[PDB]
Ligand binder design. Structure first.
Ligand SMILES: Nc1ccn([C@@H]2O[C@H](COP(=O)(O)OP(=O)(O)OP(=O)(O)O)[C@@H](O)[C@H]2O)c(=O)n1
Ligand SMILES: [Mg+2]
Ligand SMILES: [Mg+2]
Lengths: 1340, 277, 50, 251
DNA sequence: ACGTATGCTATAATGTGTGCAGTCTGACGCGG
DNA sequence: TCCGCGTCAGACTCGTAGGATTATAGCATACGTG
């Protein structure tokens, strides 16, 4: 165990030892984008792929061409720190080397004529952070991984297109990565059709003719052969015994010597073995049997030379006699069977109105380009271009892989283009399924739903940049002069830059990171969607997609999805789930070797899961051996039953792999309905971090994993002692073993201090380590906004009691103590950012001065001369943050204003007012202000005071860097010098600037002194250019929108307290509005006196079926009971040995506790720092399904000297008399949701008005009245209340006469109806007249 | 058959003369002297060349059908003014016209807010200068960075970049969710709500009461100067047209009316209360 | 589902018992969102005639 | 109209109009030139494409897509269906004297009562404060009354409190299924941003205090005050109209 | 004079295509 | 007159959130108002 763990240990009730440790939760996002930038040498991936794919590009003539050489990423112009603040993309320069090669025309290919070569920029690509975010225009945004139909082949069947026929019509469909679609489909008459791009329906033999296949070859490919010999006079026929199988003997079947079956008799398996063992090959048959049979190949009369009967023609008696006397006593026919080998291509050819190859390419061309007269080349070029050109078509690796294994092929990896073989093979398996063998694939299987992360999508969007450049290259090359024109003159950098920023902005997958909570960040990065482009739609979405599929097991979470119309499509990834190298998902599984459950793990694909039988994690291992029980509950083939020991092949690794991150944090999930579990995990993401991070007493263990991997905390890169602790930063000295011998070895971690979130909340990093503390590698040094000693802290736990209270907990309504409000524990932080813009209007430029017309000295008190509020100035709604003034035009001073400005005076400067003032209602503390100015017009004085600090603070901060880096660098040299020339004080006489002057003997350590000496100089010279970059970027003027001159961004610090209307919940979906903050006098309390914090309604439990909250309560109480005992011993100031015995007795209680923590290993000092954190309550871990049971909880309650029941004797605070009977009391870890009432409440009397509808606007954002829709209207129609409605149609909405007239009447007191007729109808009249329709209002 | 306006026209040009060198001269020679039939032919014949010239001038302002129409107008002006006697071909001379007429018609019908050629022509060179810079600076060029390479004014570059700003549609959905457009948010500048309408009505009714509370010769001079009761807003000197006919006594009486009215606002409860306003 | 849920909320579901519970839970909540429009559209249809 | 950000914005009609006028004027030009009929044909086909696209864009063929690869909104579209004038900007309206907020329980209230925040009812009854103020002679004018309210001075609360007494307010919850989806009460001012609703009528709204919001509406006219007290009052609405059975029943 | 608008250039070049393709139950409206 | 398949019509009601394009030569007389 580690030091940071020694400070506070979580009691783990797990009994299934973790063979696989929880992975980095942000694996997908980081590894995905890593592939995109990764310049692979050959195995093209990301950009390298994009270039080799499109390039080399050659002119339309083909005399000149552009060739890709190599590319590179320059370091970012502005780093994350800067980018987040300024407000422009955190992107890297793309420099690609191009080569313009030109050939000789009359000569063959003079490739060596002018090999021009240079490097060219095109577009700046947003980079990804270490958190898996993209900084777009100063916003850390997340690109959600997409879930789409995997390319290759797919067999489906509309179980009843025409329920008229009710025929299951089977269809096949080749889905490429790029290219046209290729579908084959049957019809009521079982005629095979082909519909390229699902366009026209064409007979399916027309595509085969296009691949040069004669009528004969076609038949010879699908159908078998039936041989007919006409010997002397008796007509004879070859019989494979296994053919007249499950059919009826239409004729008398007799052989060399025996009659087997009679006319009109079923030929059974007995009769088939009877014939097959007799080794029957030939049988004499009647001539009436051929009438109906289809002739296979063509048969020309040897004599004349004319076709007696063409291929694929139903024979007759007279045609057969015409063939017998022609001179053919060997006829080949089709093996037609209505049951097994079906005759489809046969009946299809009879519909097929085409003839040869060239004519088949015509109707294919007449489908897709109808109206253009076809030529030999246009018809051939089209068809060859569709599925047979390296340009148009690309199945890709996954496409060909799924395509091949769908056809049970030989190859995993093959060609991007469809070969003739592929097409016919597909038609073949479609016909196999139609016959009976072969099963259709289903889309809901994750083996067909591929995952596409950002890096692959960034690659795709980067291709369109290259495709849009391809156009401009070719056209400029051909007609443009060859020599003069340079390659960068033909390249454009905007089409690539615009096409990539299109993705990093407008796309549905690129959305603002939900970062109001570490859990929100990590679960939103692990979100996977089926929506946006190349996916599905709420309009298009069905049910079976949404439905949980047994493939989800271990791959996707069953209980993680919005309850909104985007319900089944959006889904989080499972805990231990990972992406298949091709695209599909895969889940860890413990291999079973010869019964022995081996610790070797194999990530089984969605495909191979179905193959092996998989035991559950419920199954018991024999401590290195096998399953203890002979029978094991297992699952396979998407079904579940008991199996024997040898039959088990694999097993679930952990018991948490079914669920996601969102769900792995819910304790006692096992005792919760999936409907409430979903809502609980959905609200846990909405949990605004509190003022003081409070650890959860009733956790799962996953707590630390989330907080750490979220990238919100600061964890140690190298272990050692914290040389310096500070609120702003942390300095740690590295140990000798880990420290590199070259550099000094002193890590710097400047902690992110209080600043804004995307949801307008607090972000802080407080040091969770003491000055001069020994820290191990990979330990949490600073905690985040919702984390505590590295563990996740989303909300706060408190003593809760389930019972009604005078209906203040009616429908899940919450009754919270004032004592919670007194501790300010659920009081939240909201850093709000407001801005002031100086624009350039037609009348003139605006500026920022304290000089504002029509103002009180009271308003300009908090401002300085420049016109910006001081840092630390408290502000309230109405007070002005930043003084702004714009030009006043030709302004018509109305007579009543010209006289009023002439009486009291103050002839306001021909300059309008528009100062940024605190929005009506908000009030907090200004923590900082940032000024952005165009590189030009002279600055404000406050803008100079801020430049003063940035500079002199950066000069100090860099001075501190080179100083401590110097001390750590000479600290090494001092130790090196002792080794050899041992002299202590005599060496430390003169100063340290003359230490590189001293050396050592010819030794490795003399080379070391030279490394550190010239590296000290390397830092000494580096320090100047580090200062240059800081100084310039502070002097640099910031590029703004056109019209804008300068901006001033203010940061406030609003601290909202909990109040009635605030929404809080547990993590079991138990929602609720705070109805009343009860007085401490009125709160119920136990015999001992301590009151309850929240009083919840017991009726929000049975109907909900989320008993996990009650177990959270019981354990929380037990856990606290133990903290209350430890709190008492630490207050009593007892002993180290007494605490050791009790705490050892606490950690060791569970049946088979996973963690067996001995305290004999802990030193006295390490025990007391532990107990001091255990006194608030012993933090407990209840794994998701391997959690604690009643036996363990009730045993813990006996250790806490708490009741076995969990119900306590409560007394009413109002009165003092006891309640009639006990109530459950305990500590439930509840949360404060983002839905706070200050951000909800709204009211309106009269305000803005809409632009054309002329009814009010919408929302408190724009100050708009509530909408009264038609449903709201019918309500008043039902009542009969006619004016109440007419009032809400006219005066309250449009009626321009009415609204103002009614206002004046109300202030008069005469609330009188004065209608006219809403504007929005007057609009509808003219709008119908604009459509050329006479709509006039016909009068009385 | 064919019901695409595109393919129909493209079919009818596919059955139109393809002229030789001496053919062009024969028709063109008669076309200048007005053969009527000749002018129709050379045009009909070279519609095919207009389409190949509009295949590179697309996706810039109008549609492909819109470019062919305005491209045809260039071929007509080329036929109105060709020189057959010159040994140089027609296809060469007509290309100069068809490329011009298209570019010009795109420069007008591309932008909603009409931009004449002068402001546009210049803007292009500023943008094409941004290309050179962007490739070698690897940084999208600023208004200054463009001004330093051309050695031209800063405001000009900025003024030309202010006319390159695009315009979003009012009916455009908001955030991958066609819930509300911009019209459902954008307020009406003109009419402020009854509160602001009744402010002026009540304020100006209170003034009608304050003018009847003053002297008869103090409201007759004060009102008719500001144009409150009178018809035209006159000045101290111009009040003499009515009956005053004074310059000193008009200025003493104007201010005497305002001084007694300042005490009427101190007593009713405004003065410094209504000074902030 | 042929195989129902044997356990209750006190004793606690195993890993599958919950996986099984999901299938019925998601489909029951899918018909809360999607099926509501047909019933609410009926209200609209009824009203206009009446 | 121009945006605050120096940008402009235009409706798609203007764009569709420019397509019609351009092609129509180009036809006038080609009829001046006596151009060959093959060209005149295209111009007439174009002109019709533009006119048909102006009346109803997405109908005859592909709807003319514009800047953001989306189709231009035509005329017919503003009269068509949900998003048309009828359903969206006529039968349904956003309404003045209207406010909404998280609701919470009101177990102390009687049936004919509901908690209404002060700062809510303040803004809601703004013209009724200015009215009662001129009567008492505390405001001489209305901009004077405006500032008196803004400063939130003590004696203004007592006037607001005066007008609200014996004055019903409409409380709506979404969705409005049956008539009882709106009921009227006598507002009781409470200091807090939460509305407090009567437990027994929670059934009619189906209002669960788990984060529900209810719209408030003030009946302005005296007839609306009588209508609200007579028809839409909670006490006058007990039994469901569907079944002759009480919906006002404890739970 | 200032801004907008109209005009001309002479190698040869002469027929476009581009891009989303698990919605669904119910109801007519033109041929076949 | 009846069957098949083409187009065309709906799919509940209120609340919140935030952003960005490419390019049209180049120069010399013709048309409109202080
Ligand atoms: N998509 C939604 C969600 C909620 N509602 C409204 O909100 C009410 C309450 O929803 P909810 O609180 O989720 O349901 P309850 O029946 O209260 O159940 P629970 O015990 O889970 O709170 C619904 O009846 C309905 O009026 C709705 O109309 N549409
Ligand atoms: Mg609710
Ligand atoms: Mg509820």
């Amino acid at each position: 165990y580690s030091y940071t763990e020694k400070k506070r240990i979580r009691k783990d009730f797990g009994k299934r030892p973790q063979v696989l440790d929880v992975p980095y939760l942000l694996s997908i996002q980081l590894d995905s984008f890593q592939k995109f930038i990764e310049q692979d040498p050959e195995g093209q991936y990301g950009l390298e792929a994009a270039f080799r794919s499109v390039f080399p590009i050659q002119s339309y003539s083909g005399n000149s061409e552009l060739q890709y050489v190599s590319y590179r990423l320059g370091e970012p112009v502005f780093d994350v720190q800067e980018c987040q603040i300024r407000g422009v993309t955190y992107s890297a320069p793309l420099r690609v080397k191009l080569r313009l090669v030109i050939y000789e025309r009359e000569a063959p290919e003079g490739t060596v004529k002018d090999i021009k070569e240079q490097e060219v920029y095109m577009g700046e690509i947003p980079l990804m952070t270490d958190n898996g975010t993209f900084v777009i225009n100063g916003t850390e945004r997340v690109i959600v991984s997409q879930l789409h139909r995997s390319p290759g082949v797919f067999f489906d069947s509309d179980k009843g297109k025409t329920h008229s026929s009710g025929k299951v019509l089977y269809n096949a469909r080749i889905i490429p990565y790029r290219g046209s679609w290729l579908d084959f489909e049957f019809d009521p008459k079982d005629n095979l059709f082909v519909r390229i791009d699902r366009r026209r329906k064409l007979p399916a033999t027309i595509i085969l003719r296009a691949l040069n296949y004669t009528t004969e070859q076609i038949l010879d490919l699908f159908f078998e052969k039936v041989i007919f010999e006409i010997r002397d006079n008796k007509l004879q026929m070859e019989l494979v015994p296994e053919r007249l199988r499950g059919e009826t003997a239409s004729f008398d079947i007799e052989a060399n010597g025996k009659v087997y079956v009679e006319k009109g008799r079923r030929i059974t398996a007995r009769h088939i073995r009877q014939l097959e063992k007799d080794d029957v090959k030939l049988i004499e048959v009647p001539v009436e049997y051929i009438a109906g049979k289809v002739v296979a190949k063509d048969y020309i009369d040897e004599s004349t030379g004319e076709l007696i009967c063409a291929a694929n023609m139903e024979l007759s008696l007279d045609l057969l006699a015409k063939l017998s006397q022609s001179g053919h006593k060997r006829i080949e026919t089709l093996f037609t069977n209505d049951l097994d080998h079906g005759p489809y291509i046969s009946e299809t050819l009879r519909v097929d109105p085409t003839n040869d190859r060239l004519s088949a390419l015509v109707e294919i061309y007449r489908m897709m380009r109808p109206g253009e007269p076809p030529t030999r080349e246009a018809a051939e070029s089209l068809f060859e271009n569709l599925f047979f050109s390296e340009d148009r078509y690309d199945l890709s690796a996954v496409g060909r892989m799924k395509f091949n294994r769908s056809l049970l092929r030989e190859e995993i990896e093959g060609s991007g283009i469809l070969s003739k073989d592929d097409i016919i093979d597909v038609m073949k398996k479609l016909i196999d399924i139609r016959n009976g063998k072969g099963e259709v694939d289903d889309i809901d299987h994750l083996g067909n739903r591929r995952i596409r992360s950002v890096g692959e999508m960034a690659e795709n969007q980067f291709r369109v940049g290259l495709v849009r450049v391809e156009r401009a290259v070719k056209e400029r090359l051909s007609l443009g002069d060859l020599d003069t024109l340079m390659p960068q003159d033909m390249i454009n950098a905007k089409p690539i830059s615009a096409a990539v920023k299109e993705f990093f902005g407008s796309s549905q997958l690129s959305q603002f990171m939900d970062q109001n909570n570490p859990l929100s960040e990590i679960t939103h990065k692990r979100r996977i969607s089926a929506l946006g482009p190349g996916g599905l739609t709420r309009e298009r979405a069905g049910f079976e997609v949404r439905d949980v599929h047994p493939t989800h097991y271990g791959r996707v979470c069953p209980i993680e999805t919005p309850e909104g119309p985007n319900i089944g499509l959006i889904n989080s990834l499972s805990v231990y789930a990972q992406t298949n190298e091709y695209g599909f998902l895969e889940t860890p599984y413990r291999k079973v070797t010869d019964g022995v459950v081996t610790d070797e793990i194999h990530y089984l694909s969605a495909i191979e899961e179905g193959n092996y039988v998989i035991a559950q994690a419920n199954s018991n291992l024999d401590e290195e051996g096998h399953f203890v029980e002979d029978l094991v509950t297992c699952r396979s083939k998407g079904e579940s039953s008991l199996f024997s020991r040898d039959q088990v092949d694999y097993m679930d690794v952990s018991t948490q792999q079914v669920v996601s991150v969102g769900a792995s944090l819910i304790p006692f999930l096992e005792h919760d309905d999936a409907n409430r579990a979903l809502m609980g995990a959905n609200m846990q993401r909405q949990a605004v971090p509190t003022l003081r991070a409070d650890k959860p007493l009733v956790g799962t263990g996953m707590e630390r994993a989330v907080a750490v991997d979220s990238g919100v905390t600061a964890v140690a890169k190298r272990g050692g002692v914290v040389q310096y602790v500070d609120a702003s930063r942390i300095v740690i000295k590295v140990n000798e073993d880990e420290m590199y011998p070259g550099e000094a070895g002193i890590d710097i971690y400047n902690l992110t201090k209080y600043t804004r979130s995307n949801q307008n909340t607090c972000i802080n990093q407080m040091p969770c380590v003491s000055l001069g503390e020994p820290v191990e590698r990979g330990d949490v040094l600073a905690d985040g906004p919702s984390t505590d000693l590295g563990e996740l802290a989303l909300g706060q736990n408190m003593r809760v009691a389930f019972m009604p209270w005078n209906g203040y907990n009616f429908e899940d309504s919450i009754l919270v103590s004032e004592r919670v409000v007194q501790e300010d524990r659920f009081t939240t932080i909201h850093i709000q950012e407001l801005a002031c813009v100086s624009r350039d209007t037609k009348l003139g430029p605006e500026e920022i001065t304290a000089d504002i017309p029509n103002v009180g000295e009271a308003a300009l008190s908090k401002l300085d001369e420049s016109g910006i509020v001081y840092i630390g100035a408290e502000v309230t709604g109405g007070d002005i943050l930043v003084g702004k003034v714009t030009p006043k035009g030709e302004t018509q001073l109305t007579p009543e204003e010209k006289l009023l400005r002439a009486i009291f005076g103050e002839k306001a400067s021909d300059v309008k007012d528009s100062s940024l003032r605190v929005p009506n209602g908000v009030s907090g503390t200004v923590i900082d202000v940032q000024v952005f100015t165009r590189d030009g017009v002279e600055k404000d004085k406050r803008a100079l005071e801020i430049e003063e600090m940035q500079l002199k603070q950066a000069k100090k901060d860099l001075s501190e860097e080179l100083q401590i880096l110097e001390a750590g660098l000479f600290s090494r040299i001092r130790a090196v010098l002792v080794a050899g020339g041992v002299e202590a004080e005599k060496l430390d006489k003169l100063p340290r600037d003359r230490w590189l002057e001293l050396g050592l003997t010819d030794e490795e350590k003399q080379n070391q002194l030279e490394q550190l000496a010239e590296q000290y100089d390397e830092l000494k010279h580096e320090f100047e250019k580090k200062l240059e970059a800081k100084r310039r970027k502070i002097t640099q003027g910031d590029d703004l929108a056109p019209g804008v001159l300068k901006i001033v961004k203010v940061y406030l610090a609003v601290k909202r307290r909990i109040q009635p209307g605030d929404k809080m919940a547990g993590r079991h979906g138990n929602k609720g509005v705070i109805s009343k903050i009860n007085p401490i006098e009125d709160m119920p309390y136990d015999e001992n006196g301590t009151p309850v914090d929240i009083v919840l309604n017991p009726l929000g439990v049975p109907s909900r079926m989320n008993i996990g909250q009650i177990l959270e309560t019981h354990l929380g109480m037990a856990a606290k009971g133990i903290g209350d005992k430890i709190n008492a011993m630490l207050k009593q100031q007892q002993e180290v040995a007494k605490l050791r015995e009790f705490i050892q007795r606490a950690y060791d209680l569970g049946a088979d506790v996973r963690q067996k923590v001995d305290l004999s290993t802990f030193s006295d000092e390490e025990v007391m720092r532990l107990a001091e954190n255990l006194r608030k309550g012993m933090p407990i871990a209840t794994p998701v399904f391997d959690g604690a049971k009643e036996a363990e909880i009730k045993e813990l309650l006996k250790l806490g000297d708490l009741p076995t029941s969990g119900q306590i004797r409560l007394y009413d605070g109002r009165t003092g008399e006891q309640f009639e009977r006990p109530v459950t009391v305990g500590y439930m870890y509840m949360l404060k949701l983002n839905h706070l009432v200050d951000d909800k409440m709204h009211a309106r009397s009269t305000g803005s008005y809409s632009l054309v509808t002329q009814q009010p606007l919408g929302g408190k954002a724009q100050f708009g009245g509530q909408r009264f829709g038609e449903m709201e209207v019918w309500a008043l129609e039902a009542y009969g209340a006619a004016y109440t409605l007419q009032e809400m149609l006219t005066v309250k909405s449009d009626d321009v006469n009415g609204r103002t007239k009614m206002y004046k009447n109300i202030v008069d007191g005469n609330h009188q109806m004065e209608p006219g007729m809403p504007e929005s109808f007057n609009v509808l009249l003219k709008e119908i007249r604009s459509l050329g329709i006479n709509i006039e209002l016909e009068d009385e | 058959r064919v019901l695409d306006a595109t393919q129909l026209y493209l079919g009818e040009i596919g059955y139109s003369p393809l002229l030789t060198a001496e053919e062009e001269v024969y028709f063109a020679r008669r076309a200048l002297r007005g053969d009527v039939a000749s002018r129709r032919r050379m045009i009909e014949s070279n519609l095919r060349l207009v389409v190949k010239i509009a295949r590179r001038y697309g996706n810039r302002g109008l549609a492909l059908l819109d470019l062919i129409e305005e491209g045809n107008l260039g071929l007509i002006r080329a036929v109105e003014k060709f020189d057959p006697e010159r040994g140089f071909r027609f296809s060469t001379y007509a290309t100069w016209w068809i490329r011009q007429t298209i570019e010009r018609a795109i420069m007008n019908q591309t932008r909603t807010i009409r931009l004449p050629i002068h402001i546009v022509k210049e803007l292009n060179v500023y943008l094409r200068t941004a290309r050179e810079l962007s490739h070698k600076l690897d940084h999208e060029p600023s208004a200054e960075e463009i001004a330093e390479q051309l050695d031209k004014p800063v405001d000009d570059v900025s003024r030309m970049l202010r006319l390159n700003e695009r315009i979003t549609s009012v009916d455009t959905p908001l955030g991958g969710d066609s819930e509300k457009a911009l019209l459902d948010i954008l307020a009406d500048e003109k009419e402020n709500g009854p509160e602001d309408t009744t402010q002026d009505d009540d304020m100006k009714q209170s003034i009608v009461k304050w003018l009847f509370e003053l002297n008869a010769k103090q409201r007759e001079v004060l009102a008719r100067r500001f144009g409150l009761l009178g018809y035209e807003a006159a000045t101290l000197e111009d009040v003499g047209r009515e009956i005053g006919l004074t310059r000193e006594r008009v200025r003493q009486i104007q201010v005497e009316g305002l001084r007694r009215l300042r005490e009427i606002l101190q007593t009713q409860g405004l003065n410094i209360e209504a000074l902030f306003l | 589902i042929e195989t129902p849920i044997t356990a209750n909320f006190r004793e606690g579901l195993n890993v599958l018992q919950y996986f099984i519970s999901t299938h019925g839970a998601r489909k029951g909540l899918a018909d809360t969102a999607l099926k509501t429009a047909n019933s609410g559209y009926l209200t609209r249809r009824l009203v206009d005639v009446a | 109209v121009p945006l605050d950000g120096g940008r402009f914005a235009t409706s798609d009609l203007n764009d569709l109009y420019r397509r019609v006028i351009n092609r129509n004027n180009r036809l006038k030009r080609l009829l001046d030139l006596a151009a060959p009929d093959i060209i005149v044909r295209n111009e007439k086909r174009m002109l019709q494409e533009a006119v048909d696209a102006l009346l109803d864009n997405g109908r005859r063929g592909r709807a003319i897509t514009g800047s953001n690869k989306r189709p231009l909104k035509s005329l017919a579209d503003m009269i068509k269906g949900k998003q048309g004038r009828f359903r969206q900007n006529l039968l349904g309206k956003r309404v003045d004297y209207s406010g909404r907020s998280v609701i919470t329980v009101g177990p102390y209230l009687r049936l004919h009562q509901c908690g209404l925040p002060k700062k809510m009812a303040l803004e809601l009854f703004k013209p009724f404060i200015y009215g009662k103020l001129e009567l008492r002679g505390l405001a001489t004018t209305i901009k004077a009354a405006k500032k008196m309210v803004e400063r939130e001075e003590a004696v203004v609360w007592d006037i607001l409190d005066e007008v609200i007494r014996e004055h019903p307010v409409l409380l709506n919850r979404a969705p409005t299924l049956h008539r009882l989806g709106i009921q009227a009460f006598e507002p009781v001012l409470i200091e807090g941003k939460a509305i407090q609703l009567h437990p027994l009528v929670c059934a009619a709204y189906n209002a669960d205090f788990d984060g529900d919001q209810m719209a408030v509406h003030v009946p302005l006219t005296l007839e609306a005050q009588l209508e609200a007290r007579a028809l839409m009052m909670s006490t006058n609405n007990i039994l469901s109209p569907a079944n002759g059975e009480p919906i006002i029943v404890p739970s």
